[PDB]
Design a protein around this ligand. Structure first.
Ligand SMILES: [Cl-]
Ligand SMILES: [Cl-]
Ligand SMILES: [Cl-]
Ligand SMILES: [Cl-]
Lengths: 391, 391, 392, 393
C-alpha cells in the first residue's frame, strides 16, 4: 500500500485575546470547541465524517481530564471520536497537523481535525506535594516554569534569544524595526478584511452583563510606536536587545484544520484549499532554538527538491522578532515574503495554537499553485516546518 | 512509496514505585531517561541511531518545559533528536508507540524511541490565577482534577466503573476475586524471574545517604487478602463494588521501546523481538470507558482477519478489576490467557506509562510466532489497542 | 478605696474609614495607625517626645509583621524609647486599649499615652496549616472569617448569633432596616454638616505614575441604595431571617488614636483637655448572646459612678449590626434620638480593631461642656466594653 | 502626688511542660495549653473558678487560632462565661506584660482577682497568602513564625542577626556564648532531676485515638543537646565572624503559663496564703536592632523606681532569648552570674514566645526564699523589654 495524499479542506481560528483580556473567561478547551466547530462548518461536511482529533496544548495543568476530548465533544463531534493532546511546546499546533497527516498517509483514517489551543490567562500556579518547608515557599507560575524557562540553561526563552542576537549581531534597533513592521502588517491586514474566511467571532456571555462580541485579534491595537525604543531590555541587563515589545506576548486562542485524504475529498464532493506536500522536525542546542527553524525549513525544501525562491510566502513564527530576523539572514530570503500579514509579536502567541494558526493562514492567503512554507521554533531547541501548495 | 513494516527491537522499564514510595524522589522525566537509556542498551545500537522520540505523560504540570526532551537529553541522546510529549490520558504510553509506528510506516524516520513516563508522587496542587475569593482559596490536586475525574459526569473514574458493574452485572465478590488473582500472578511472576529482561534496576542516590537500588515492583506486596472483602467501597458508599484493593493504585514508573522499520533493523543487524501487526483507537460515551477496549480490540482483530482464539496472550490494562471482567465478559475470552503475569491492580498504574509497559511485557512473554493483544482504556471514554506477533 | 490620678483626653483623631478593597486598601493597618497617631499628637499640640507609651487595638494581626503597635508608633516618628503593646479584645480592642492606657495613667505609671485601634481588613491574608498537604487538596481559610467573624463555640458567623437575639427580643427585619436607613441618613447629614472637621484627617494615597487620591471622608455611607434595602435577602439565615448585608456592618479599613494624659500633665504641658475619663467596665455573657453584653457593661459603669441612664446626653453603642443597637435601646429603655446621633458602623463601616476607639473619640468631639457620654461595644466571644466620659 | 494603690500578690503560678517544635505538645493548640495552665493555677491557688474576675494572656502569633484566643483558653478551663478576656501582644515580652497590665487593674481596685499569663503553639503557626490578584511569575506563601515572630521589620533581618550586632559591640565571643548555653542545659537537667519544678509544672496527657496515651511531664528541649557538637556548629545568622548558633540560641517551642493574681485584701478574704508580692515593673525600648540591651534599662528603671541596688536582688531571670542576651545583661549590670537563670532558661528549656515572660516570673515565685527579691527581665522584637520585681512572702 502506497502513501495517501493529504489535503487541507478548511482552516479556522478564534481571534487571539490578550493576557487576562477579551477571551480570558473561556477555558482553552472551549476556544478549542469554537475553532473545531467552525472548521467543520466551513469544510461543509457532516461532522460524523471526522474520524479522530489531535490538538496541541502546552500548558495542560488544571484544564481537567483529556483536554482534546473536551474540545471535541464540546464542538458536538461524535463520542466515537478518539482524541490525543500534543505537546511539542511552541511547535504543538503544527506537530498536531503533521501527526494527523501521517495517520491519513497510512490510511488509518480518511478525515481528521488537527490544531492547537491555549489559554494562558487560565494557566495556574503550583504547590509541590509534600510537607511545607519551614520559612515559606513560592508557588510557581506554570507559564514561567513549564512554558518559558529553558530547563538546561535555567533562563527565560528571552535570555536564550540574546545568545543568538549576539552571535548573529542582530541589534536592538533591528528587532524593534521588525516588531513595528509586524504591528503595521497586522493592522493593515485586519483593515483590508484579510481574515474574513479565517477568523470566526466569539460571543462572551456573562450573567447579568451584556454580551461582548470578540471579532478581531486584540493584541495588535496595544502598541505605541513612540514607546517601542524606550522599553528596557528585560531578559539581560547588560548589552540586551530583547524587549516586551519586540518579543511575542502571552495570549489566548485556538485554531483547527479539517484534513482529508484526496480520495475522501473526492467522495465527499469537497474542493480542498491546499495540499500538504512535506514536513520536518529539526533540533539544535536548547539555547539556540531561534535557529532550528532554518534547519527544519531546509530539510523540507531539500526533501521536495524546491529552491527557497520557489516559496511564495513564509510563515516563520514570531516567538521573538529576533527569531524571524535570524531566519531571514540565514536563509537569505526576501523579507517582503515573510509574515506578510503580521505574526505572533503583534497578534500574540497562545503557544499551543500558533503553529496551527500559521499553517491555516497560508491556506487562505496563498494564490492557486503557490507554495507556502511555515516554520516554528520550540522550547528545548526544536522546530517544526511544513510545506503546502494552494489548489 | 509503500508503507514500511515496523518491529519492536527492545522494550525496557523501571520498576513501578508506590505513591510516595521507593521512586518518589525521581521526577517522571528522570525515570524516562532511565527507561530510554536501558532500551537503547538492550537494543545494542548507538544512541545516535535514534531519530525521534515520543513519550506518553498525562500529568505534565510542574515537570518543566518539554518533558520528553528532558527525558531524551537526560539519557544522553543527541541534541538533534526531536521530541513530542503525548497525552491520551491512561492510553498515553500505547498511543505514543502507535504514532511513532505511523511515522516509521511513512518512511519519515527509520528508528524511534516511544513509551511513557509518570511520577504521580510528584504531581503538584494548583491555585487558580486571579483574585482570591472572599472566604477562602481552594488548592486542587492535579491527580484528582486532571487525572481521575470525568469532565462530563463530574465523578471519579471509580464511579464510572460502578456504572459498568451495574450494567454488566459484575459484583463486588467477582472484582475482589479478580484482584486477588492479579496479586497472586504478579507475585508468582516476580518469583519466577519473569521480568529479568524487561525491568532494569534504579539506583536512588541521596546526598549523605547510602545508595538504594530499587530492583522490583513495589505495589504487589502491599495487600492483605483477608482484608480485601472487608474494605469499604470508597467510590459508592451504598451497594458499591469498587475498593482501594480491587482498583489500581497511584504509582511512579517509565517504559520505553526502540522501534525500527524492517529495513533499519536489517541495516543495523539487530534481532527484532516482535512485529507490530495492527493498532486502533475506539471511543464510547465517557462514563462507559471500561468497555472501550472491547471495541478497540475487535477493530484490530477485524483489520487483520484474526479471531479472538488466535490470540495467545491478552494484556487488558487493569485500571480496575471491573474493567478486565467487563472485557472478558463481552469478548468471551479465556481468563487464563488474560494478564497472565499480573497487572495494574497489583503492579500499580503510573498512568502515562502503563500503555507502554503492557506492550513491552507482551514482547518479552510471547513465544515465537504467537500473537499478543494489548488494550488500554482511558479517561473520556477512549481505548487504544495493539496487536503484535513475536518473532 | 484607691486614690488615683485623674485621666483626660486631650485629642482624638482618626483616618476616614475605607471600604473593603476600597480607597485605603493599599495602606497596611500599621500605616493607618501611624497616620492617626501623628494626627492625634498634632491636634494635641504637644511634643512627640512627651508620649511615653502606646497601646493599639488590632484584631487581625497575621501577616502585619513583628509588633504592629511598634510599627505604627515608629512610623509616626515617635521616639525609639516608646514602649508599645498591641491589644486584642476582638471588636472591643480599640476601647479596651484606651481603658488599659487609663489604668496605667491612674496608677501613676505613665503621665501621657497614645491609645487607639487600627485594622486593614482589605489586607488580612489567607492561611494554610503547617504540615503535609492532604491528598485531594485543601481550602486555605480566610482569616477575616476564621479569626474575625466566626464564633468558636457555636461554629457560626456573628450575624447568625445576632439572629438568635432578634428571635428572643422580637426584633423584626423591618425595624432593623429602619434602623439601618436611619444610620445612613445620620452619617450623611453629619458629614454634610461638617461634624467631623476636627476628628477626621485626610489621607493621600500615592501610586508611582498615577495621580494622587486624597481620601477626605468615610467611603461606606455613600454605598447604599435605600430602594434595595427592603428587597435584600437575609444572608446569615434564609429561614425566618432578619439580618442583611445592608443592615449589618461591613468590612473596612481605618485607624483611630487618642492622646491621653493625667490632669497634672495637661497643666504642665499647657494644653486644654477635651474630656475626662470617668469609668469603664467589661462584661461577658454566653458567646452567642454578644449583642446584649453592652447592656450589662453600660449598667455596670452607671452603677459604679452612681448615675442614671437619663443623665447620659449621648450614647455610642457600636453598630456591629442594627440588631445590636435596637437590642440595647430596648433593654436599657433609652431615648433613640440620643443614640448614635451622627451615624455608626452600619453606615460608616467597621474596621474591627478601630471602632471602639472611634466611638470614644466621637463622643469627645460631639459632647457639649459638662455633658456625659457613654460608649459601648460588643465583641466576639460574648463580651463588651463600656466607657463613661464627661466633656470639659 | 503619687496615687495610693492596692497591694498585688501572686497566689499561684503554674505552667505546662514546654514542648519542642513539632514535638510532644504539637497536637495541642495554644488556647488548649492556655486552658491547661489556667485550670492548673486556679486549682493550685485553692480558690473557686468563679472568683477569677478577668483574664489577660500573652500570645504573639494569633493567626488561625480562631476568635478571641484568651476567651477560648478561659472558657476551655471551665471559667464562667461572665469572665472578660484580652489577648496581649508585646512580642517576646507578652507573658510578662500581661501580668503587669493585670497588676495595674488590681492596683486601681478595678478587679480583686485576675489570671494573667501567656501561651504559644509555634508548631501550629500557619503560613499566609496575601489577599488580592495573584502576581505574574509566582505567589509567595510566608511563614508567620518568620514574618511576624522573628524578623525585625526595620532592619529586615532575623532576631539572631540583630543579636550579632550586640555580640560585636560588647565583644561577646562564640565560646563564651557556648559556655553559657552548656551552663543553661546543665542547670536545666540539674533542676529537673532535683524535682525543682514539682509545684511549678503540671503534666499533660496527650490523647490520640487508636494510640496509647502519652503523658508529657517534663520540659522536652533540654535533653536535645550534644555538648561535643556545640563548638562545631555553623553560625547560622551571619556569614562573616558569627557567634550565634542553633545551640546557643533559644528554639521554637510550645507552652503556656498562668498566674493567679489578687489584691492583698482578696487573699485575706479568700483565706489564701500569698506566694509573692508584686513590687514594681517597667518597660524600656531602644533601637530595634539593639533589643538585647533593652532589658538592662528596664531592670535599672525598676531598681531606681523602688530605690533598690542591684546587690539587693537574690535571683535574676533574664530571658535566654539568646545566650548572647544574658551575657550582655550580666556584662552591663555587673551582677553575679551565679544569681542569673539558676534553674535553666529559654536556651535549654525552649521559648514559646508569648509564654516565656510569664514562665520566668512564675519561676521566681517558686524559687525565691522568704523575704528575698527576684528581678525578671525579657527583651522583645522591636527593641523593647519588660521588667518585674517581686518579693517572696
Ligand atoms: Cl524538540
Ligand atoms: Cl479518546
Ligand atoms: Cl470578653
Ligand atoms: Cl516595645
Amino acid at each position: 500500500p502506497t502513501l495517501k495524499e493529504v489535503v487541507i479542506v478548511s482552516a479556522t481560528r478564534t481571534p487571539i485575546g490578550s493576557f487576562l483580556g477579551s477571551l480570558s473567561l473561556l477555558p482553552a478547551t472551549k476556544l478549542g470547541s469554537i475553532a473545531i466547530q467552525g472548521a467543520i462548518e466551513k469544510a461543509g461536511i457532516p461532522k460524523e465524517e471526522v474520524k479522530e482529533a489531535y490538538m496541541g496544548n502546552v500548558l495542560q495543568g488544571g484544564e481537567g481530564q483529556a483536554p482534546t476530548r473536551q474540545a471535541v465533544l464540546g464542538a458536538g463531534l461524535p463520542i466515537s471520536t478518539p482524541c490525543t493532546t500534543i505537546n511539542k511546546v511552541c511547535a504543538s499546533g503544527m506537530k498536531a497537523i503533521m501527526m494527523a497527516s501521517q495517520s491519513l498517509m497510512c490510511g488509518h483514517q480518511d478525515v481528521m481535525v488537527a490544531g492547537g489551543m491555549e489559554s494562558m490567562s487560565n494557566v495556574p500556579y503550583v504547590m509541590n506535594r509534600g510537607s511545607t518547608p519551614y520559612g515559606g515557599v513560592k508557588l510557581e507560575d506554570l507559564i514561567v516554569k513549564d512554558g518559558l524557562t529553558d530547563v538546561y540553561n535555567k533562563i527565560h526563552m528571552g535570555s536564550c534569544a540574546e545568545n543568538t542576537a549576539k552571535k548573529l549581531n542582530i541589534a536592538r534597533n533591528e528587532q524593534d524595526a521588525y516588531a513595528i513592521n509586524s504591528y503595521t502588517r497586522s493592522k493593515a491586514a485586519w483593515e483590508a478584511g484579510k481574515f474574513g474566511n479565517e477568523v470566526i467571532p466569539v460571543t462572551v456571555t456573562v450573567k447579568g452583563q451584556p454580551d461582548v462580541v470578540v471579532k478581531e485579534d486584540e493584541e495588535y491595537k496595544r502598541v505605541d510606536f513612540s514607546k517601542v525604543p524606550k522599553l528596557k531590555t528585560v531578559f539581560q541587563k547588560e548589552n540586551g536587545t530583547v524587549t516586551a515589545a519586540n518579543a511575542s506576548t502571552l495570549n489566548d486562542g485556538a485554531a483547527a484544520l479539517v484534513l482529508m485524504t484526496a480520495d475522501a475529498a473526492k467522495r465527499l464532493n469537497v474542493t480542498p484549499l491546499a495540499r500538504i506536500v512535506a514536513f520536518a522536525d529539526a533540533a539544535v542546542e536548547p539555547i539556540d532554538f531561534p535557529i532550528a527553524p532554518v534547519y527544519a525549513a531546509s530539510m523540507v525544501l531539500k526533501d521536495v527538491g524546491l529552491k527557497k525562491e520557489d516559496i511564495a510566502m513564509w510563515e516563520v513564527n514570531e516567538a521573538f522578532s529576533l527569531v524571524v530576523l535570524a531566519n531571514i539572514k540565514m536563509l537569505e530570503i526576501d523579507p517582503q515574503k515573510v509574515n506578510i500579514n503580521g505574526g505572533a509579536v503583534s497578534l500574540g502567541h497562545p503557544i499551543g495554537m500558533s503553529g496551527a494558526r500559521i499553517v491555516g493562514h497560508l491556506t487562505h492567503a496563498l494564490k492557486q499553485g503557490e507554495y507556502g512554507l511555515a516554520s516554528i521554533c520550540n522550547g528545548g531547541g526544536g522546530a517544526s516546518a511544513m510545506l503546502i501548495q494552494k489548489l
